[PDB]
């Protein structure tokens, strides 16, 4: 599933991401935009053997276990496959963990969102 910006904004809001850890909703939508272009099925394999999964491109070395990544911490305590769900719940719950333990974790966020009017990402949306 490739989310629409607003649909994702609404879903993220529904998942309490708005101002989660002080990060306004647009941060998360923006992060998702640049991480996966809102594609819940996005996967990016890294040379380190880890893979970034889902709408928030959560890495399998630290956050989820995909069973093929060495040094798997699985801090989100989830199989990476959970991150490929069409609903964003697992990704959001993990993202909440990632941000709990700053959104810089998403190089994409720090680089394409941080420092911009991230709230622009939730404008026009029925929230």
């Amino acid at each position, epitope marked *: 599933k490739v989310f629409g910006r607003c649909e994702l904004a609404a879903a993220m809001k529904r998942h309490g991401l708005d101002n989660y850890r002080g990060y306004s909703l647009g941060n998360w939508v923006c992060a998702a935009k640049f991480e996966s272009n809102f594609n819940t*099925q996005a*996967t990016n394999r890294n040379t380190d053997g880890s*893979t970034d*999964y*889902g709408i928030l491109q959560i890495n*399998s070395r630290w956050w*989820c*276990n*995909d*069973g*093929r990544t060495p040094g798997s911490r699985n801090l989100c305590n989830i*199989p*990476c*496959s*959970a*991150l*490929l*769900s*069409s609903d964003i719940t697992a990704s959001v719950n993990c993202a909440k963990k990632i941000v709990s333990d700053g959104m810089n974790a998403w190089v994409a966020w720090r680089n394409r969102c941080k420092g911009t009017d991230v709230q622009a990402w939730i404008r026009g949306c029925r929230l």
Partner: nanobody
Amino acid sequence: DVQLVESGGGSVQAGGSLRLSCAASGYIASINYLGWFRQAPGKEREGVAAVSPAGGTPYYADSVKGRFTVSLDNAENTVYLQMNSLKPEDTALYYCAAARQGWYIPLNSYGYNYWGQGTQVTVS
């Protein structure tokens, strides 16, 4: 987004055979592995067999490999478990499960995201 419905279970005599079927419906394209997990009463579950729909590669628990065969019918999004030379040790609840991409240990239930109700298989 995926529903798994098993059927084909039942009680058979040692040496007998049963063919479990698991029909997947829904977002079948999101399935990377369709597997069978079994669990005896009060015992830990065990990955029995799994197959990746796209490439058809099958995986088997050593205890059933060369005995059981798993087959996938992508046309019907149904995975089957041909249980040949059944033994008492095969008695258990057999669960169909589907794992999306992101889980690469076929016989490890951890990354399976969808589960069937589990069909009982009893071997006497």
